[PDB]
Scaffold this active site. Structure first.
Site, mmCIF file in Angstrom:
data_model
loop_
_atom_site.group_PDB
_atom_site.id
_atom_site.type_symbol
_atom_site.label_atom_id
_atom_site.label_comp_id
_atom_site.label_asym_id
_atom_site.label_seq_id
_atom_site.Cartn_x
_atom_site.Cartn_y
_atom_site.Cartn_z
ATOM 1 N N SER B 203 -38.637 -39.633 -36.667
ATOM 2 C CA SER B 203 -39.144 -39.253 -37.975
ATOM 3 C C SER B 203 -40.628 -38.937 -37.925
ATOM 4 O O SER B 203 -41.076 -38.018 -38.616
ATOM 5 C CB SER B 203 -38.860 -40.360 -38.991
ATOM 6 O OG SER B 203 -39.418 -41.599 -38.583
ATOM 7 N N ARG B 207 -41.230 -35.253 -39.495
ATOM 8 C CA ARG B 207 -41.973 -35.147 -40.745
ATOM 9 C C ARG B 207 -43.188 -34.250 -40.565
ATOM 10 O O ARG B 207 -43.456 -33.369 -41.390
ATOM 11 C CB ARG B 207 -42.397 -36.536 -41.227
ATOM 12 C CG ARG B 207 -43.127 -36.529 -42.570
ATOM 13 C CD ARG B 207 -43.826 -37.850 -42.873
ATOM 14 N NE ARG B 207 -42.897 -38.969 -43.024
ATOM 15 C CZ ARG B 207 -42.598 -39.846 -42.068
ATOM 16 N NH1 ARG B 207 -43.150 -39.755 -40.866
ATOM 17 N NH2 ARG B 207 -41.743 -40.827 -42.316
ATOM 18 N N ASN B 211 -43.380 -29.708 -41.691
ATOM 19 C CA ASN B 211 -44.392 -29.333 -42.663
ATOM 20 C C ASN B 211 -45.175 -28.117 -42.212
ATOM 21 O O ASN B 211 -45.448 -27.232 -43.022
ATOM 22 C CB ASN B 211 -45.341 -30.503 -42.896
ATOM 23 C CG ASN B 211 -44.727 -31.577 -43.760
ATOM 24 O OD1 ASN B 211 -44.501 -31.377 -44.953
ATOM 25 N ND2 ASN B 211 -44.451 -32.728 -43.160
#
Lengths: 77, 266, 52, 67, 77, 77, 77, 77, 77, 77, 52, 77, 77, 76
Positions: B203, B207, B211
């Site tokens: 993660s 993450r 983005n």
């Protein structure tokens, strides 16, 4: 000619979800705003300013998804 | 130039990969199959940004003083302030490595992302039409492998620090008894706790990555889909916003690193 | 399609973006720096008054 | 255990260490154990239950008050 | 034929979702309004003023969805 | 063949959604009506007037969904 | 060719879901923001600061989704 | 004919949604009734008056819904 | 060919759900953080530091879905 | 054949939605009841009475829906 | 998009950019600041003894 | 063939729903933990322990769905 | 192999919706059980008996849903 | 062919719905547990015990849904 019905169905989903989002965000925000107003009614003209200045920032994305559904319907047919 | 908008867009979706067996350049139209095809564009930017961070810092580090700092030194010590302020409370053990770990993560990730604000087409032009390079893109974090490498480095570190500071004898107990503690559940317990461990580096990587992949995409579309007198009017708000994400993701990565390790060791 | 027009578009975009940064973002940077420098400098000044 | 003071405007009615009490708070009947989080409420007229450490119970009648 | 007779499913999705949005949001706002009124049972008319202000914002986007549902049902279809 | 059989389904979409919305928009408002009223029972007759004034906007838009659903359900199908 | 429809329908769902998610995530936060403002009206700016800091997180996935929806609707097609 | 299973489901949609809506709305309103009751147990008959008096309003739309689903499942199907 | 029309759809839906989850969760978490801020300034840095213990954990699952969604949309199709 | 096929699906929606609603409603209701009991153990029976009375109103529509599901699964099967 | 052998090379670059800060940037940077931290801390004890 | 499409769809939905589940389940819990700290920062290092002991459970189902989604990608394709 | 395929979607729907209903409806209740505990520890046995007696209602319909799920899956198959 | 992806889709939907339910429920119950603890910190043990007791009744149906989802996904 199946094309020209799903082109409307996409708009159906695309512009229903947007209405739900706008309604929910504004409703919760306005409810909390009104409780703030009632607990101090002397203070309303400040809170209301802050209310609008936030509310636009919620409705940003509803009003773009609406636009893309409008495009798909009126222009793309 | 026969590039349809759909097709122009593609060239920015394309990396400039090497092939280590042939040291050859993998052309965009046919992608060779292999695991041995380095992403040069992500690497050159990675090393250049890392080094021009380290240069700015280490130039003063040899020279730092306790008088009133130089303004450039003032900023160095102020980002040291944010860094040490975070380290100072979330970490409690002796270890040296934690602080520069978090710092080298924070500023380096910020730089890798910092590039995105660069006008999206500009530098690919000096890639293709000057030095003869078939395609390029200019945000390392938008190339998965760097985030994967860094977060799985943190994975190595989680294993390493945790085993160092409580040993296998208790690490097995934790990894097997929890959460229900009663001895019949142990086999099923470990399954749930295992990938619970692994999702942390995963993660961390994803993450951040997503983005910036999706960050670049919006600028690609700004270039591709709109006339000159409207590409600027979406780009003003989109820069106004992307400032925020490219800062927040680095801050998140830093804090999450420190927190993840702290939970295991302390 | 013509690749050139994107150039004018991103020129306008980057110019106005930089106006935004300079006029709104550089001032807080320099001001937090000046604030920290004031704290350091008056700290040393009062420390020297104390050593007097 | 924790220290309980029952005081009136006129004179003091109790002071000693307690294991638990049970008090009829205005909003609802409540019970307080060592380390209870800070709380402040009116209370209704009625009894209050004390257990003096070593569990020795007693009851007190109040005309109301604030806890 | 279905190439029109399915348009009604599009209109249904759109305007029914809009009905959900407007209903829930308006209800929440009204609930906080009623609580405030009960807690300031003389201030009411000013609260009713503000309730009506922020109320239509909840129906700002649902009404466009209603418009376009009736569009699909009585201009297109 | 595809005229009525899916018009049942589409009207059912419209009216079931409007039923969800119109049940919950009354529910929440009524909850805040009751709990406020329980504190101020002496004011009840004013509170219920405010309740009805609010519900008039709450359910007005679901009323559209259900009446339109009937316009489809009986006439068009 | 048919292929245009399903891509539009795929993007539509992403943009509607992003709309709802973002709008709710901002409305809840803004509600707490305003009810706090009504307590510490002098310190509004500090609340605004941290509010926008967090709103930078609320919007992440929803605008990822809006971007991918635009990409699908205009360059996958 | 194939429509027999379509009438069943076109009724079943409206039936399930009516169930959800009515159950949630009445549950909420009853919950506030039960809490309010604990404070002033002297009032419970008046509270229960108000509860029935508005609960008659909670369900009107679901009582269109189930009726008109049965209008299919036991007459038209 | 049929593989496109639904290999894109799978990612569209997967990332829409990933949007909803994180948007809602972070909305509520930040709402409670602003509750803390408005109630208890002089703690804002401590609350911020703790809050970002949780905020990363909220994104834990959804961001995996967003990464795999980008994989599906660009490596699978 | 298909007459034999969709009489499971048709009951699926009904019974699933009913099982959701009838659980959510009375979870809400009984939660408010249970705290109202914790606050007033003098009034456990008096409030238990009201809990049953009020429950009697929620499960009406869920019971109709689930009974019609049982109908479609065993009577018309 | 594509897995790549870059995933190792970046670890090789990462741990090196770590080392170049660990033993050679942070200890100097924070120590030069600790000197100052003390030098403003001492002024209070200096005036304290002057007061006593 | 399209089995790839629907198997990837199976992975898609499997992960998509569990993402919302595990995000909102932590949002709620953190939302309460934060206010618990807000009233009294000296209890932070205790509540932030029981927080982990609780949140450990929240993932037991969703981080099964996660691994099985990854499997349905890379083994079942 | 055609005729039985829908029994395996129909067996999943009725199971999953009963799972959601039961879990959420009993959580919303266990929360109030825990509050009734923390306000009065020495009432915890009586409140636990009350919790069981109440939850005997919540689980009713879900048990029927899952039972008919078992039926359709293994007996009907 | 046209069939089996239906079974796999059905097992995915099973686990998805069960995860939604068993995550929301545990989250609500856990929030109330943490705040009850923050209220009476020295009843953490008693509250944790009774919290386990009440949790057990929440997980039943979702865990059965996972059971049957795995059976559908691998036993058929």
């Amino acid at each position: 000619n199946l094309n020209m019905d799903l082109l409307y169905m996409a708009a159906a989903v695309m512009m229903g979800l947007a209405a739900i989002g706008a309604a929910i965000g504004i409703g919760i925000l306005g409810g909390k705003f009104l409780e703030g107003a009632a607990r101090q009614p002397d203070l309303i003209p400040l809170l209301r300013t802050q209310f609008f200045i936030v509310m636009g920032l919620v409705d940003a994305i509803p009003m773009i998804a609406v636009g893309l559904g409008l495009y798909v319907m009126f222009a793309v047919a | 130039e026969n590039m349809t908008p759909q097709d122009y867009i593609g060239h920015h979706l394309n990396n400039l990969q090497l092939d280590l067996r042939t040291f050859s350049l993998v052309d965009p139209q046919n992608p060779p199959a292999t695991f041995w095809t380095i992403n040069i564009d992500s690497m050159f930017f990675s090393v250049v940004l890392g080094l021009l961070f380290l240069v700015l810092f280490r130039s003063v580090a040899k020279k730092a003083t306790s008088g009133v700092p130089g303004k450039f030194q003032t900023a160095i010590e102020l980002v040291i302030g944010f860094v040490n302020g975070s380290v100072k409370d979330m970490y409690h053990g002796k270890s040296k490595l934690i602080a520069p770990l978090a710092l080298t993560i924070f500023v380096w990730v910020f730089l890798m992302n910092l590039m995105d604000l660069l006008p999206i087409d500009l530098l690919p032009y000096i890639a293709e039409h000057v030095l003869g390079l078939p395609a390029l893109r200019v945000v390392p974090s938008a190339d998965v492998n760097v985030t994967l490498s860094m977060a799985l480095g943190v994975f190595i570190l989680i294993l390493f620090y945790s085993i160092k500071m409580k040993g296998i004898g208790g690490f097995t107990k934790e990894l097997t008894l929890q959460p229900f503690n009663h001895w019949a559940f142990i086999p099923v317990n470990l399954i749930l706790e295992g990938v619970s461990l692994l999702s942390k580096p995963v993660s961390l990587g994803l993450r951040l990555f997503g983005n910036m992949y999706a960050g670049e995409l919006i600028f690609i579309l700004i270039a591709g889909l709109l006339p000159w007198w409207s590409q600027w009017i979406l780009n003003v708000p989109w820069a106004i916003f992307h400032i925020l994400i490219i800062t927040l993701q680095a801050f998140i990565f830093m804090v999450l690193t420190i927190v993840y390790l702290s939970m295991a060791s302390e | 399609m013509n690749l050139n027009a994107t150039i004018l578009g991103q020129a306008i975009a980057f110019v106005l973006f930089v106006l935004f940064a300079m006029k709104y973002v550089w001032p807080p940077l320099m001001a937090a720096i000046e604030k920290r420098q004031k704290e350091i400098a008056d700290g040393l000044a009062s420390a020297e008054r104390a050593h007097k | 255990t924790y220290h309980l003071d029952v005081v009136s405007a006129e004179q003091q009615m109790f002071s000693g260490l307690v294991e638990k009490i049970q008090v009829t708070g205005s909003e609802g009947e409540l019970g307080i154990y060592p380390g209870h989080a800070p709380l402040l409420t009116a209370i209704k007229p009625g009894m209050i239950r004390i257990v003096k450490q070593h569990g020795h119970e007693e009851f007190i009648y109040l005309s109301g008050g604030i806890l």
